[PDB]
């Protein structure tokens, strides 16, 4: 189920984003896609994994914010060939500064949504609004992003 929570006692102008999004290190080339898929789809579906081997790491999106707090905890330090796999939060939307990446929960004031964050936010299939207006006091999970802006599809 979409969250869309009134948070009244967050700051004010702000809403809070919950990520979707699960920092990667510590990937050697012995660790690949196929076998890092396997080893997130215990906790839910994967929507995006993506490595990339010449900066040790990678990033891995859910559908789901409650899959991605599970694997976030089981997936924390795992030793693994010649490395360990230590997946922590990471930051899909909204500006990096306003995400702690101790939770990867953000809260943004709404005045630092760019033009293309708002619109994602209101017409995301997983997560954002579900086509509601953004309006503050509101916790919702990390849009998807990086398509086009449009209300037609
Ligand atoms: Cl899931
Ligand atoms: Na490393
Ligand atoms: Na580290």
Same mark, same amino acid.
């Given at each position: 189920?979409?969250?869309?929570?009134?948070?009244?006692?967050?700051?004010?102008?702000?809403?809070?984003?919950?990520?979707?999004?699960?920092?990667?290190?510590?990937?050697?080339?012995?660790?690949?896609?196929?076998?890092?898929?396997?080893?997130?789809?215990?906790?839910?579906?994967? &929507?995006?994994? %993506?490595?990339?081997?010449?900066?040790?790491?990678?990033?891995?999106?859910?559908?789901?914010?409650?899959?991605?707090?599970?694997? &976030?905890?089981?997936? *924390?330090?795992?030793?693994?060939?010649?490395?360990?796999?230590?997946?922590?939060?990471?930051?899909?939307?909204?500006?990096?500064?306003?995400?702690?990446?101790?939770? #990867?929960?953000?809260?943004?004031?709404?005045?630092?949504?760019?033009?293309?964050?708002?619109?994602?936010?209101?017409?995301? *299939?997983?997560?954002?609004?579900? #086509?509601?207006?953004?309006?503050? #006091? %509101?916790?919702?999970?990390?849009?998807? %992003?990086? %398509? #086009?802006?449009?209300?037609?599809?």
């Amino acid at each position: 189920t979409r969250r869309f929570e009134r948070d009244p006692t967050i700051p004010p102008d702000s809403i809070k984003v919950y990520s979707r999004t699960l920092f990667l290190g510590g990937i050697t080339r012995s660790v690949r896609e196929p076998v890092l898929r396997s080893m997130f789809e215990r906790f839910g579906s994967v &929507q995006s994994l %993506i490595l990339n081997h010449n900066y040790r790491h990678g990033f891995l999106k859910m559908f789901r914010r409650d899959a991605a707090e599970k694997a &976030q905890v089981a997936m *924390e330090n795992v030793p693994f060939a010649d490395t360990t796999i230590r997946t922590k939060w990471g930051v899909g939307f909204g500006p990096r500064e306003c995400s702690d990446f101790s939770t #990867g929960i953000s809260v943004i004031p709404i005045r630092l949504l760019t033009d293309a964050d708002r619109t994602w936010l209101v017409t995301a *299939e997983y997560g954002g609004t579900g #086509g509601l207006p953004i309006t503050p #006091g %509101i916790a919702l999970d990390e849009p998807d %992003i990086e %398509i #086009g802006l449009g209300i037609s599809s």
